[PDB]
């Protein structure tokens, strides 16, 4: 039932930060109400709630999307205090998708967090403790790959957050770096981003770009990883060579000379290491 808890938190001597657990745990579906109860240890009548059980309740509710319940309780109970807006972003994003207002309300959240800092009932630091979970939850759970880019660019400036979150800068860079490509991210970097895991993943992304031939964006992509830019140029060269053989231009001397010259011409534009160019030559030389 859920029209009893509201009366319960109206008699003289009820912890206003308690009855919220009762409401939010007794106004959902069966499996949701049950599987969330695992955090409890004692029996039903001997489990005085505190500012800790709401944590597992919050997490369980947000996971397996159901937010129009929390975004709804926090109005009867503890009012406009900032956690409400920190969750109100989550309806305009990842459900309702009018991102321009999302940017407008997140900054209002920051301003209020700063201003009101100039005793509460949600444990002061508890906000900053738990907002960092709504963030990675709003991020990890998104499905469409192009759906990711808009959030990752929304954040951008306000990077002080995501304490253990993935590195925003390089992430948004990669996002824009495929702003129209057919590829998709893998979320493996998203959940656990590392200085080396990024490369251990992006090697496949580079190979995938290499297969299609759209080599132009490949340079920008591999640039972020600070990986060796060498073989990419040689691969583009081989692709051109096979293209010419398909046009069979290697027989005609003029095109052959033009290609062998544009080879060095472009190679200057890449400033590759000497030895790689020496090999690129000597291989065709022995072939010649």
């Amino acid at each position: 039932a859920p029209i009893l808890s509201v009366l319960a938190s109206c008699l003289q001597g009820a912890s206003a930060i308690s009855c919220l657990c009762v409401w939010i745990i007794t106004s959902v579906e069966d499996n949701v109400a049950t599987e969330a109860m695992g955090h409890i240890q004692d029996s039903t009548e001997d489990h005085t709630w505190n500012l800790e059980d709401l944590s597992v309740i919050w997490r369980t509710l947000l996971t397996r999307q159901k937010s129009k319940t929390l975004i709804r309780g926090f109005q009867l109970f503890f009012k406009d205090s900032p956690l409400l807006l920190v969750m109100e972003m989550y309806e305009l994003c990842m459900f309702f998708r009018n991102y321009k207002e999302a940017e407008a309300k997140l900054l209002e959240f920051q301003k209020s967090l700063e201003t009101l800092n100039t005793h509460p009932v949600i444990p002061a630091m508890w906000l900053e403790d738990q907002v960092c979970f709504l963030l990675k939850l709003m991020l990890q759970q998104c499905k469409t790959q192009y759906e990711l880019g808009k959030l990752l660019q929304l954040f951008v400036e306000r990077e002080h957050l995501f304490s253990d979150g993935p590195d925003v800068k390089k992430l948004c860079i990669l996002c824009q770096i495929l702003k129209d490509t057919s590829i998709a991210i893998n979320h493996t970097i998203i959940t656990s981003y590392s200085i080396e895991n990024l490369q251990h993943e992006c090697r496949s992304i580079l190979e995938r770009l290499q297969t299609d031939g759209q080599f132009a964006l490949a340079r920008r992509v591999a640039e972020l990883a600070e990986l060796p830019v060498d073989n990419l140029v040689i691969k583009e060269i081989t692709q051109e060579m096979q293209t010419l053989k398909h046009i069979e231009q290697w027989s005609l001397k003029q095109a052959r000379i033009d290609f062998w010259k544009k080879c060095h011409e472009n190679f200057k534009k890449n400033s590759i290491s000497s030895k790689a160019a020496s090999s690129f030559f000597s291989t065709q030389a022995h072939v010649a």
Binding site: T69, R72, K143, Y146, F259
Partner: protein, 188 residues
Amino acid sequence: VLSEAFEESLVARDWSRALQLTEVYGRDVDDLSSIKDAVLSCAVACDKEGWQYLFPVKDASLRSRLALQFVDRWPLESCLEILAYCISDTAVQEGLKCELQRKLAELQVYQKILGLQSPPVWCDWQTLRSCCVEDPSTVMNMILEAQEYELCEEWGCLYPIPREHLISLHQKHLLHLLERRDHDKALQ
């Protein structure tokens, strides 16, 4: 009493005082998504603010079919965004993907055309398509007026052009390309 709420709030399609009575008194279970998708649909195409109601429908096939149905009344600054993630969805049947993609092509082309000059060579998607239906010569002239041949390639690719001047169009781009010694582009 609770069910005399939809069947009287879908008389006047106020689908914001009727998507409430399915979330406040609804005990938000999983299968309610279909009952929500229905109303969000039936309010997609009822007002000039159609942009912001065809994103939150979970059934992807519905996203597709509705977008193809009502791409018309939209500004070229928003219909593009609406189509983008649909074409970027990973579930729609491959049959609809071709159609939605093809429409994205024309949207992009009319965007690039709509701003070559500093002001109005048209008024919107609508005006430019009407003119393309109309004498398809002023647009081709303006397209060549920047010597930006590749855009004209599409601006006729969606609109068959005169069998006479097409050669005069085609050769000039090859000339310009050769001017910088770009062999492969000229070959293509």
